[PDB]
Write a protein that binds this DNA or RNA. Structure first.
Lengths: 106, 247, 43, 72, 85
RNA sequence: UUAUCCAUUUAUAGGGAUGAAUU
RNA sequence: GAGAACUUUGAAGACUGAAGUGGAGAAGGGUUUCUUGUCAACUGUGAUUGAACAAGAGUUAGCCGCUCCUAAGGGAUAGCUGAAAAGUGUUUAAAGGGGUCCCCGUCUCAAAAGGGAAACAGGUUGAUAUUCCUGUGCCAAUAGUAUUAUGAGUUAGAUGGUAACAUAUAUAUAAAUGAACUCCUUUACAUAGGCUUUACACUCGGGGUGCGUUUUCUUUGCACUUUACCUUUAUAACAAACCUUGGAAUCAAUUUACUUGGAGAAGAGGUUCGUUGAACUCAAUUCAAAAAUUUGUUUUGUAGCAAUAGUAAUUCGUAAUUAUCCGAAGUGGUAAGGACUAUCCUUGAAAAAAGGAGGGAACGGCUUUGUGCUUUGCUACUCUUAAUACUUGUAUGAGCGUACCAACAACCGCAUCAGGUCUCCAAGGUUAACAGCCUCUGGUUAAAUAGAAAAAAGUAGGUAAGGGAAGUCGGCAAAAUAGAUCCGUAACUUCGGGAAAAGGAUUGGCUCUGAGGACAUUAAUGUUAACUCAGAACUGAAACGGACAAGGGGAAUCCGACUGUUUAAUUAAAACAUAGCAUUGUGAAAAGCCACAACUGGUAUUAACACAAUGUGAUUUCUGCCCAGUGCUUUG
RNA sequence: UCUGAUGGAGGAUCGAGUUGAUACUGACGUGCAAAUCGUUCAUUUCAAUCACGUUUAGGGGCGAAAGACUAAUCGAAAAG
């Protein structure tokens, strides 16, 4: 079996220094340490990641692509689908409830 | 001799509370004109666990009335409150589980938690998990009520003092037995340096008045006076009686 | 260490420069010598 | 680099004043064919071919005002 | 078949600790983790989530409750008296 | 209550009959 | 070389041997690094060697780190004490910023393993390299005018989809307006268990390139066969997210495991995020049929970087050329990702920084009246990306660290000391295995010495007839099977265990045999990947987990319940601790306990299911009498 | 109810490493070593181990408690 070698000056394996080796055109096994995958914006109601977005780290999100930042319903980074439809059918529900109450108050 | 463990406790070198992961102090809403003259409803967004204590806390979001915005408060949760409900604070707020009311508004015999032993302390008494006080009397002229605390003692508090109606959550926490030293270690690791104890009779006579001897015995009465100095208050402090109780 | 402060590196260079012997032409007319292994300069 | 076969864009890129390097391979498919590489400031744009006539068409479609160099 | 005749869940403790102590946590083990009933969905599937925090398997909305029960006998009585008014 | 002492805060509205709401 | 057991070269025999005297490692050291020369001393023997001595030389960064942020915390400010020294750090912050009047806000330091702008491959030196060269990129920054273009939207801002979903491929997918004031998200987080994907790792047979015994035989024993940063690669599958619709009972999709559902499932149709970043015709095409454009079938590619760079065998000025570089898979060793399940009286960190949103202060121009506003003519327009040319300071890119050792003589042990001192890597055989044992890349063949002889004695071991603890304070030391399969397993018990109880048989060998998955045909026949069992043989020196590797059991008594901890260098325990039990004090800032000289503070981000102070010490069963003595406590 | 049919809990077991130190009261004891070497033994999913940073200072600290440790110094460190 071949033998490995460290590069990144962070010579301790931490969740910012995870290693993968792959073969190179020079014919030797050099080092390739990945970036840390980032989380996704999530549901304020049922704790589910929002959709229409990707999970780039803040440095990359500073340059991210816009159409994979928000799915197509108004806000974008607000809420998931089955939990936004609840508010969707609740809005005019509450409005009508207050309206009928203020009408039949007499 | 030398300074004993009890005296060293007060120096606060390693005996400071291990509070790196605590989520914040559990304080009631600060007194306001709105809360003094009516209800204000804030919604509890999430019930979280504070590592130091057993009783879960609640993150109640109120909407500030003097400015646009919201203010988040950490409030000891009563047994039976859930995320998404509106909790009402003030004199005119209806009485219900979790609601915070002036003490002199609710009738006698009701169960309260997160007591305020002096008007404005935003929560001082009855805060441990599963604890509750009972309002056992109101003065005829108002401005004074009597409550019975979980210790079994009656205390007189002014009627303007606020409290939550209900019982502190996570009740009965002391019911299950800690099976092993490991659970006690994990319990006290997030609280203090009070564990393990180590008997004073197993120490040397230099470090403890109980220590010494060829037979591991106290040798002198273990009921010490209330006037005993710092290095003497080590046994049963000013004990009125000893032995098994008879009710 | 392979990583060091500027002042530490400058002092190391000064000690190395001070460890050289007396010029021969001057001797024609030193006791403060240290070996890196025997005596440490204590920095 | 991008394996591109559509010729409309290939004749479109003929007006870019930044492409200078032209490299010709000579590889035996089984027949002698070639892969024509041209310089692009962001990519190593090499075009793979399937017909010697098309390769000869392209290697004269190159705008000859600039440099020529081949690895072999 | 049925491997534990009486010990049940306490089999993870082996022979350690007292029999009466394991049997006293036998009063509580069958209910700390048990699937109890939620009041917003209707399935007997609630599970322990923390020391005081509780959750079923449908609602995704947590509830403050007892140490190892959704409700405590003190807290159901206290709520009943308040509701009666 | 004025000395004095204690508590709270952004010293932030005079007394009685699970969505928001700033210019 | 004057001089060679310990300098160099070649040959041989060997070792380190998958957890290395191997590469990179940090602390610590500081020139020990390299070249040349040299041997007065040192290199405990020699020494021409050297980490010694002498002269020169050597460390190149926008992308690797520090520098930035915040934690445990440190210092300081306001005060307040104190003779000061010093003690504490908002205890009556008037403390910088923001936008355009108001809002927020002690300062500073503390991480070369936490968070974090962006670099890869080949090559190069006597000594530096992801820093130097070549090539290819990436990130951050960039002030005032005139030209362009691209795309958008418009005479103040789009698209479909029953839905989920998705929506701009110019040089780059930029082109769907926007203030104060706010609300979120990323950063951003535990452990255990298995499942799965992918790269890498290893491996198998036959195609392209080299050596060999061959007395006795060979399709003979083997050996060398590549592709970074850069592209959402598209895909596709699979894991999850998500709609229509069926409208289930003789409930159903299903997972290794359970999960999910009438707030919607069989069943069907439909749609993203996450992966490897060539896998499926992906990129086309030869040709046909759909049709004012799609579907199928054949030729090109190591999907594009990509071979040409590197690499390898024979000829060949002594500089060259050659062609290969392929069908495939199989194991699961190491990493990461995904979706899950489970555990906590344990819930497993912050900011810097970045992004999204609610709302709407302000939005088409030229000139023209009066005082930013009503008004008269033409309506062409404005921005998102890239720049180009002149004025501002010159308009890219600071400073520091980069050599070497990292112990085997460069670190600490008074030393070139068998000691101590922070990750990854593992092929075969053997295996359960990163164990042990032999070897393969790499390294070494050196240790404060060498010959010869080989007695006593010492030390580290081996083997011993017959007896088998008679030795001895005491079975001290050593031996005894010990892996695996089949069988069998008591007293007692807290019912969980005891238990590998005890106790047996076998395992040697080869000739054998058989049985147990994925791919296709109108009940059967073809292509292609396992290691688990069983019985007949005979045979071999009647002996075999053949080396390595590995439990001695049983009957009882005493102590301690257990796991754990302890007298660093004479005592590891019956000692301590521990869950359990019990007692005591305390309702609070005029409390309990404790610190402080005072100020003040710890518990306390606490509140009797709490804190503090004790004693006893699983469980089971008990815990008797005595308040006279001494303590503690209570009334009058 | 049992039998048979399925998984992955435990301060569970063996066991290298790691952390230690039971015995030989072995060697050594003018040692490699002012505590080492050999064999043996204990420990390895948690009261676990390690590193760096940081806090606690001497009639003080810290101590699962040995009069232990606090730089070869401890029934009161070291320097003057």
């Amino acid at each position: 079996a071949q033998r490995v070698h460290y590069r990144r000056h962070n010579h301790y394996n931490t969740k910012s220094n995870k290693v993968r080796p792959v073969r190179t055109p020079g014919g030797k096994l050099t080092i390739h340490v990945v970036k840390k995958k980032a989380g996704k914006p999530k549901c304020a109601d049922c704790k589910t990641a929002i959709q229409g977005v990707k999970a780039l780290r803040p440095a990359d999100n500073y340059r991210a692509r816009r159409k994979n930042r928000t799915v197509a319903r108004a806000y974008g980074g607000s809420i998931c689908a089955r939990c936004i439809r609840e508010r969707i059918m609740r809005a005019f529900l509450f409005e009508e409830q207050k309206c009928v109450r203020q009408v039949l108050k007499e | 001799g030398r300074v004993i463990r009890g005296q060293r406790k007060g120096r606060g070198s390693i005996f400071k509370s291990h509070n790196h992961h605590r989520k914040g102090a559990a304080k009631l809403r600060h007194l306001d004109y709105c809360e003094k003259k009516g209800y204000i409803k804030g919604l509890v967004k999430d019930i979280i666990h504070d590592p130091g204590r057993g009783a879960p806390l609640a993150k109640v979001i109120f909407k500030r009335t003097e400015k646009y915005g919201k203010k988040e408060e950490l409030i000891i949760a009563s047994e039976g409150m859930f995320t998404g409900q509106y909790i009402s604070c003030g004199t005119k707020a209806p009485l219900s589980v979790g609601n915070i009311l002036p003490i002199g508004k609710m009738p006698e015999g009701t169960l309260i938690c997160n007591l305020e032993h002096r008007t404005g302390n935003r929560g001082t008494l009855v805060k441990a998990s599963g604890c509750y006080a009972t309002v056992v009397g109101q003065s005829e002229d108002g401005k004074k009520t009597k409550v019975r605390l979980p210790s079994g003692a009656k205390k007189t508090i002014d009627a303007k003092a606020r409290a939550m109606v209900g019982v502190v959550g996570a009740g009965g926490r002391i019911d299950k037995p800690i099976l092993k030293a490991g659970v006690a270690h994990h319990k006290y690791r997030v609280k203090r340096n009070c564990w393990p104890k180590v008997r004073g009779v197993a120490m040397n006579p230099v470090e403890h008045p109980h220590g010494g001897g060829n037979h591991q015995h106290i040798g002198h009465p273990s009921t010490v006076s209330r006037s005993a100095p710092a290095g003497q208050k080590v046994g049963l402090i000013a004990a009125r009686r000893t032995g098994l109780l008879r009710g | 260490g392979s990583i060091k402060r500027f002042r530490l590196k400058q002092r190391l260079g000064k000690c190395r420069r001070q460890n050289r012997p007396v010029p021969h032409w001057y001797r024609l007319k030193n006791t403060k010598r240290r070996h890196w292994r025997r005596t440490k300069l204590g920095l | 680099p991008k394996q591109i076969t559509d010729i409309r864009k290939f004749l479109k890129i003929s007006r870019k004043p930044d492409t200078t390097a032209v490299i010709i391979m000579k590889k035996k498919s089984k027949t002698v064919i070639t892969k024509l590489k041209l310089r692009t400031k962001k990519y190593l744009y090499t075009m793979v071919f399937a017909d010697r006539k098309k390769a000869e068409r392209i290697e004269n479609s190159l705008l000859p005002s600039l440099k020529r160099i081949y690895y072999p | 078949s049925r491997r534990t005749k009486k010990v049940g869940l306490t089999g993870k403790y082996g022979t350690r600790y007292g029999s009466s102590l394991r049997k006293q946590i036998k009063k509580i083990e069958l209910m700390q983790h048990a699937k109890y009933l939620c009041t917003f969905c209707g399935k007997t599937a609630t599970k322990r989530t923390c020391v005081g925090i509780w959750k079923c398997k449908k609602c995704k909305r947590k509830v403050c409750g007892g140490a190892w029960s959704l409700t405590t006998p003190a807290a159901v009585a206290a709520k009943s008296t308040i509701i009666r008014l």
